[PDB]
Structure formats: structure tokens, C-alpha cells
Design a protein around this ligand. Sequence first.
Ligand SMILES: [Fe+3]
Ligand SMILES: [Fe+3]
Ligand SMILES: [Fe+3]
Ligand SMILES: [Fe+3]
Lengths: 307, 307, 307, 307
Amino acid sequence: PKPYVAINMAELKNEPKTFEMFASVGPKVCMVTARHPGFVGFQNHIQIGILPFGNRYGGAKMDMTKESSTVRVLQYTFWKDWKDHEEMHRQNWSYLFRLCYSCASQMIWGPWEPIYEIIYANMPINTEMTDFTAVVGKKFAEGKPLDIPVISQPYGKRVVAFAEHSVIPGKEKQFEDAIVRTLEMLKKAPGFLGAMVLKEIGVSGIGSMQFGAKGFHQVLENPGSLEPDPNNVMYSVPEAKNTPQQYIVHVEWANTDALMFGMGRVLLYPELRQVHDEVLDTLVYGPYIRILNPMMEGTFWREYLNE
Amino acid sequence: PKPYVAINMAELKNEPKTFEMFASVGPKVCMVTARHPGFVGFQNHIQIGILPFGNRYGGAKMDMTKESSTVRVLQYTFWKDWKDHEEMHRQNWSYLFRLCYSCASQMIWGPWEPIYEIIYANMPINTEMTDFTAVVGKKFAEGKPLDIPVISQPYGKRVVAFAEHSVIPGKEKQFEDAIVRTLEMLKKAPGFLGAMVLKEIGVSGIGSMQFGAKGFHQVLENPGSLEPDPNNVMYSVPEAKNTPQQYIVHVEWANTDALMFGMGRVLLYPELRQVHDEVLDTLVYGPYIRILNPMMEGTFWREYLNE
Amino acid sequence: PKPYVAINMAELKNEPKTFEMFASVGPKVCMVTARHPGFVGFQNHIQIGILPFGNRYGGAKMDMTKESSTVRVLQYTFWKDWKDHEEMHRQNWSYLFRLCYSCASQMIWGPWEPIYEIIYANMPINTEMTDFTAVVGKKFAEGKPLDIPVISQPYGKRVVAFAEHSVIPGKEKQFEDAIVRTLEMLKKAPGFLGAMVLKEIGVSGIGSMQFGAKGFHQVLENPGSLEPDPNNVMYSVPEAKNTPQQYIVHVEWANTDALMFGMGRVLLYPELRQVHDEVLDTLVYGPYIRILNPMMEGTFWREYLNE
Amino acid sequence: PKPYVAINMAELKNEPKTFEMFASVGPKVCMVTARHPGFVGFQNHIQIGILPFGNRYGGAKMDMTKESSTVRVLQYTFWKDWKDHEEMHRQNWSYLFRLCYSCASQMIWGPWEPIYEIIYANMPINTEMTDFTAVVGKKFAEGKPLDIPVISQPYGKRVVAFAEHSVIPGKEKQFEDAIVRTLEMLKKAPGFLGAMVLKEIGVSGIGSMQFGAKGFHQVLENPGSLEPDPNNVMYSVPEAKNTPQQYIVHVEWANTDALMFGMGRVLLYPELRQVHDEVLDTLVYGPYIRILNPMMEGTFWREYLNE
Ligand SMILES: [Fe+3]
Ligand SMILES: [Fe+3]
Ligand SMILES: [Fe+3]
Ligand SMILES: [Fe+3]
């Protein structure tokens, strides 16, 4: 079934110490999150750059890692029920807060953790290049060659287009209908590895370290080993849902060239351009497209997705 | 009276070429904007850093300019009526678009131009250190020594705390009452040069280069000398207003130490801390505090503010 | 169906500034061209070298990019009707001219844009290495394993042999019959990714910036933002068709070794040599073979080709 | 059928001289071992690092070869009956001892040669990337597409997780049942190339150069060309079997990322975590996981395994 998605976002100093902490602390956070039976996996990204759209963002390029002073992370966690995410945070708060807070020395902005419903998904299971022979054998044995997926390699060996959209109030249905039509046509592009549309349902105060006054002071005053009061979050997840409605159009690609020209198909192929124009007419903001590297992941979220 | 504020936000490459364009293109944009009689001035900022709040943002510091790969600009223009801004853009679109678009080669994100109303202001006229003798003489001659302001030096010779807040729906009145009480007490801090509270009323699509499909393609395909259809903006300013409600708490300071410990007064002075706690209990996001340098400005906006 | 092909040819300075402009301006031109419903895609090449034919061109090699002072581009655009190309140029002249003229600072020769009919095509859809599993599954499910193509990777991950021929008047049918027989046999060579034969039908004056006196002066005098009179082109496309008849034999290969020995099969394999000798007997000029890299492309042109 | 496994373990100086001897002496030892008809192949490893388990072993990393002062080798030989190994050593003692003893100048610890039975195996035949087309063709021709293996590349082109476990006496059956259930679920992880469970049955005294007093002196006093008395081993293989019972869980992976996150599936995927917890409850020691490179091997041992 379709899981819910929590995306923890932060910006940190682009230096070796940061990536060393990703390597030691990141796995610990994921192991704690996996204590909850509603957890069905994760996909953690670093932003490597920005799609320049010609020279609309002429100061950007798809890989800015060599020059950037910061690194943005976008950590997707997947949940049977979005309420499972909220319960997990509170049930394991002592570990989670102390782990997450240890990243403070590297932090410039965040954490900020919106929650999403998936309204469309065409996403395959991940496979390594070593797996495809067995995958093909099995699908033919089952008499379902149509279910043989493209090879979507895990652990940093593909790239993601993270396309931000916000929609004019009242035009949500037009956006959703048109973007689904767009993505159903987009899958013809070479190197297309899947797409999904995420629709914001709210924001996790606790995941964003956004408490009332009491918790705020506890965060600011923390030596690193004392939990803020987890009951001091002052808003529920839906209370923080944004209007204009926010969406993420998440599209995966074999490589950054396939991404650039593939995403570009909605501009370069007249038939698809006409369909995608219906998306563009609904927007308050976007499309703004971040280029992401899915480095650390629990690929079994796609097994749950596709059952 | 209190003007409306349009804040054009962008992120650009941190390199000499960017600042060379600020120097050449910036004044031209301001001269075009001054064609409209509703224009009452401007205050243009570059972000120099982020308030670390101890080590809550431990990767940040108040001056990050030597290390940062990007520069964020926040260009305030002040307007008698917010519709004056929208009218100005359209009446002068040929000049404005071509000027603004010439920055494309340096752009990483933006432009994004929310519009605000000022709901609280305690902001003095700017004066240079050469002026105070005459200011004092004049106020005494008028029998109004209480009207003698602090010395708030223009053109990069003071600093700004730009504090982002978003508020739980239904808690706006508590936020507004508490932040005003806070700022009324904060003005006792040494080096305090003024404060105002901005409340978002919407977003300028045309100022954000956010069009329908037609205008989007014209922007992407532009050689630099052809205007997108200015009538192709698909939403009014209020249609893009965010919920949760967004605010900016803008506080000016003599120097960054006065900023750090002065803003810190809401955490360090128990009586004020109790008042400011009422602000904190209402928040979805924040406070996140950017440190800004007000470099290029039309100081006469404060003459309008203060009659 | 078979589209018509326009090939925009130019020679530019081989320096980073040139490739920076390819990256920013190139996509803009393609997006403008895609405004026309007759546009079915594109395949844009840079020449990387010349086939030396042993040491017949002993000063040449298949990759001369490290030493060359110039770069030659060959930009294929594909059209339902060649008249669509002419209409597109005129309907979007303000954008197209200003964009294309921006390349002037780098130009040494060109642009020159002949138009071609495709008289033979054996060209597959492009696929990335990630795609083949799904392609195979799909074709077997449809009961068409014979329609499973070789893997022709897009975006610079294969090479093109661009073979120029001009034919003795009266020998066009002998050439055409012989070259088709040759290419039908050539497809047995390892790494063969497809071939097509292009026959010149004329030249686009407007695409070649070739006007009468009025337009010529407007081009020479242009500050960059003023269109030459598009009605000042003095000849139709067919009026410029060359005699001796010109052809391009376009053959794609997995890599330059496969190209060298694969194209060499018409010299090294006695059965094929006898067939290709019938081609050679018809020539005024050629074969002269440029080695091309298809870097930027709209791969859906092959979808139109293959229906 | 399942062969027995002798694993000769040693630690040597990490310097070119050591690897030069691997290259010269290694093949000779294997050729001597192949004199015995019970020999069914071999798989020789060097340890490249240690799995850090987050920062549980924070001083370790998966590839420590650039910094390490030593190299650990783990040489697997496979046998129809474990007595074949003991017989092979004695029948060829003159050659084997002199060859093995020539490594003395590089040795820091070892040799130590436990013997194991395989109690669980899901291990494919090795194939190179050149082979898979023929493998697939053959399996389909035989009507057994389910028998098509993943591509497990020989000769250092994959990696091994070597997971040490010792089990509380009386809890062996719980361990064995739980680890098999774990590995049956683990095979879903991307890049999984196979797993087997080895259960220690004893230690080869002669393979470990562990003699009585007489043989010990002959070893210490050896000029290199005189055999210790092979009859002076004072214990049989089963007499040296350890209690607590020792096991090796041997899992093969496409690459070290697939290893890290794949092995991590038993911690990160709640359903699998619950199963693997039953393993953890039985342990005296472990899991301690060595990262191995299977460099030199006789791949036909898997042909015996799989008939
Ligand atoms: Fe979370
Ligand atoms: Fe504006
Ligand atoms: Fe053209
Ligand atoms: Fe042995």
C-alpha cells in the first residue's frame, strides 16, 4: 500500500566532520526509528545541486558539491500511518532527541519535518546490476514479464529530481489531474526510474524541534543529555499544513543527463508540453528542482509500496 | 503612516561578479521603482550570517561572509498601498523585467517577493554621526527633547536581526500582543536602534516571476530583451498568503554584539523572558534569525513612517 | 513516419566560454523550437574528430578535441513537414534570432542549415542501460521479441559516423540502391546502433542568416536585440538544393573502435566490399567521415520515426 | 552436497613482500591440495576491514587497507569429507609444510585452521558479466527460469561479510533456527549474492602447526627444508572443537554499500529485526563482522555444492 512520508530537512556545514557524523549518527537514528512496527523504510538524500532551467538559475548547476559551503539533507522516512511517526518520536524520545541533537554543532538551518500523503506512485523496487538476471527469471516463471522493472540502483547510484510546487487555492484538483497525466507520459523518457507525487498533510512539531516556550528553552539550554518535554509540542500535524498547498514531484533518473533532458521532455516534446502547461497554470511557486543523491536507504519501503 | 513592505528575496553566487551587478543594476531598479508616486523608499540587505542561539545552530555564526558560497539578498521596498507595488511593476514592466532578468546568470534561487503590512513600528529616522548636533538643537528649539532619536547610521553602518516566525492558526492574537509587549521592553537594551513587526498579506506573482504556462515559457526562453506577458500572472497577491500566518520581527542594532546580547535579553532577563514565552507558545516555526547588513537604502521611508 | 531533418552547422572557438553558452543558450533555442506542433525532436552533435582512413587523412584522428582550436556543431532538428521548420523560424523570429545571434562572439563560420529528406532509416529508440530489463519484458509480453532493439544510449554515450557523399549527376539511383544494400549488410557489425541516409532537399536561408542586402546589413549592424526582416530571405529552400546531389550517411556505433572497424567492414569484408564498391563508383566527393558526439538530444524523435 | 570447510587463518605484515609471496606460494599450495580427490575447491580471502555498526567499532571502517599494518588472510578449502583434508595434509606433507613454512618471515599470528560443516547454504555458481546471456539462454531452454542466479562475479569482484558468533551452550537450536529464518528473509536485499552458515566441528592441529613437544621443536629449529613429524599431532580434529559453539555467518554482496545496508536490514526492517532478535538472545560473543575480499578462488566448489 501507499505509505505516508515524513521528510526531515536540514542544512549543515559542508565539511568532513558533517559527513563523519552522517556515517556514525545516521545509522543510529534509523535503528531507533525501526523500533516502531509502522516503520516501513527510509530514503535519505543529500542535495548535490539545482536544476538551472537553461540560465533561469544561471548561478546554479546540477552538481555544486565542489563549491558549496553547505549541504542540505532530506531524510525520507516511510510509515504505514503518519500517526506512527508521531508515536515513534515520543516512544523513543530519549534516544532520538539526544542522537539528533548531537548534530547541532554542524547545523545552520533545521530540522524541519513536513509530513506527506502519496497521491500517485510509479516506483519500482531497487535492484543492483547483479540482481537483474534473477529478477527476470522469476518474473517469466510467474508469467508476468510486464512486471519486470527498470534497474533502479540503490545507495547513491542514481539521482533524484525533487520538484517543489505550491498551488493556487482552488486549483488543487487541476494540478493533481494534470501532474498525473504528465508523469504517465514522462515515463517514456530514457533512464526514467520512477516517480511519485507527495502532498503535504502537515508538519511534525516534535521532528522539527518546534516546542512551546518550555521545550524551546530546554533545547537552547541543553548539554546534550536532557530531553525537552515531548508533551510541549503546541500543534498537531494537520494544524501546520500549509495553504497554498505544497507538493513534491519526486522523479528518479539513471544519471544527471537523463534527468536534465528527461525532465526537459515536458518542455521539449510538444504533446507533453501541452499537458504540462496545465500544471504550470495552477502554480503559486515553482517548479523549483533540487538534484538529490539518495545515499543511505532502506529499500524495503518499495516492497511495502508495491506489496 | 505604516507603509506596506515588499521584500524581494533571492540567493546568488557569492563572487565579485554578483556584487559588481548589485552596483550597476541595483540603482537602476530603484530608479525605475521611484517612477511611482506610491513608492516611499527602500532598504536593501545582504545576509551576512545566522544567529546561532548558543550552539542550536552550531554550524552558523553571525558573520559567515568569508566562507559562504552564496549571498542572500532581501530587498525591501515600501509602499503607501500594496496595490501601488503591483501597479508599479506593470507600468514599468519593460524596464523592470529586463533589469531584473539580467541577474539571471548569478541566480541560484528566487526571486520570491512576499508582501507585508507593518503591524507595529518603533523605527527612527536615520542619521549620520555628523547630524546629531543639528537634530538635538532642532528638537530642543521645538520643545520636544523626547523626540530626539538614537543615532541609527545609514548605508551599512548598523546591523539587522531578521527573525522569522510562523504562527499556529488561531493563536495570531496571542502572538501579536506578546511580540509587541516584548519589543516595547526590548527597547531598553543598549544599542537598540528600532523594531517593527511585518505580517504577510500575500505574494507578488509578477515580482516572483511566477506566471502561468505562457509566461513561464517566455521566461525560460528569454534572450533578455523580451517581456513575458505581465497579464499572465494567475493569482492575486492575497491568494498566495500563507497559512500558517507568517511574520517577520525586524530589529535593528548598533553592532553584532549589541544584537546578540540584546536579542538575548528575551532569554536572559527573567521579566522579559516571561513575556516573550507567550510568543514562543504560539509558533509553528521559528524564531529563525538572519543577520542582515542594510547596505543600499532610501532612508526617506522612515520620514513617511513617522510623518 | 520519416521526419524531415534540418541540420544547423557552425564552427566556433574551442574554449570554455563556447561550451558555457551551449549549456545556457542551447536549451533555450530548443524550447523555442518546441513551440511548433510539427517539431518532433532533435539530436545535437559536436564533432570530436575525423576518420583517418589508415593515413589518408594522416593529420586527423577520431578524437582531436584536446588539440583542436575550433569546435564544429551539427544540430539536427526533426520535422513532420520541412515547411514546419520554415514556419517555426518565422513565427518565433524575435526569440530565435536574438538567442542564436548571442552566439556570435564565439563564431568562426556559419550558421549553415541544409534541409534533408530521409530516404532510408534503421534507427532504434534510445535507451539507458537501466531500461533494457523493462524493454525486454514488455516486448516478450507483447509477443514481439524481434522488436527488441540494441542498447543505444542517449546523451553522449555513443558515437556517430557522419559520412559526406556527393554524387555524379545521373547516378543518384545507383548510389541510393547501393548504399541501402551496404547498410543492410553493415548492421551485422558488432556495436552497430543504427543508420540512416539523408538526401539534401535544399537550404534554409533564414536558418543560415542568409538574407538580401537589407537583412545582411541588419545582421552586421545588430546590437543583439533587433530582428532582421525575416521576409528578406531571397530564395526558397528548394532553390538552394545542390547539384551534384549531396547525401549524409549517418551511422551510429557503441564506441570509436566499433565505429572504426565497423565502418571498415565495407573495406575489409570481401562480400560487403563488392557491394560498397558500387557506391564508390558514383561519387564526385567523399566519403569524408566526421566523428560526432550526440550530446544534447530530444530522443522522442525516434518514437515518431518508429511509431 | 554441502562440503566441509577448512579455514586457514593467519595475520601477516602488510607490505608488498607479503603479497608477492601470496602470488608465488599461494597457487603452489592450492595445486598440492588439488592432489586429493576429496578436494572440491577453494575460496581465499584477505580482510579489508571491519563493519563498524554505526560507531560501536568507531575506530574501524569497511576498508582499512590503506592504514593497516597487518593483513589477515582466511583461506577456505572445501572437502567432501573432513577427513580428506587431514589425509591430504599428511599425504603431501613434504610439499605442504615447506611451502607453508616459507611464509614464516611475514607471519605475526597463525596459522590456525578450524574445520566447519555447512548447516545452511544459499550460494550460487559464480559467473562473470560476460556469462549471463548464455546462462539465461540455457536455463530457459531447460525450462527452469527460476534457476537463473544473480551475477556473483569471481576473483575479487564482490565482497564478503564474515560474521562471527559463539552461542550459549543449550541455545544452539534457537540460534540455528533463527539465523536460517533471518538469511531466508535477508535474500530480498539488493545486491545479495548468497549466504551460508558454518558450524565449527574441530581444529586441524597439523594445519595449525600445533604439534607435541617434538614437532614444536622441529618447527622452531627448521631451516625450511625439514618436515616436522606429522604423526606428532596430539589431538584429533573433534577434540579441539570449541564450547561455546562457534559459527560463521558468511554473506556475499555486490559491493560494500550493499553489504552495509543489506546486513543492516536485520536492524532496520522491523519484521526482520524481530526474527534476528532471536539470534541475538543466544549469543556469548558477536556478531563481529569482518569485511573480506574473495580474491583467489576455485569456483567449482559451488558446482559441487549445487550438484
Ligand atoms: Fe521524524
Ligand atoms: Fe517588487
Ligand atoms: Fe533551423
Ligand atoms: Fe589445511
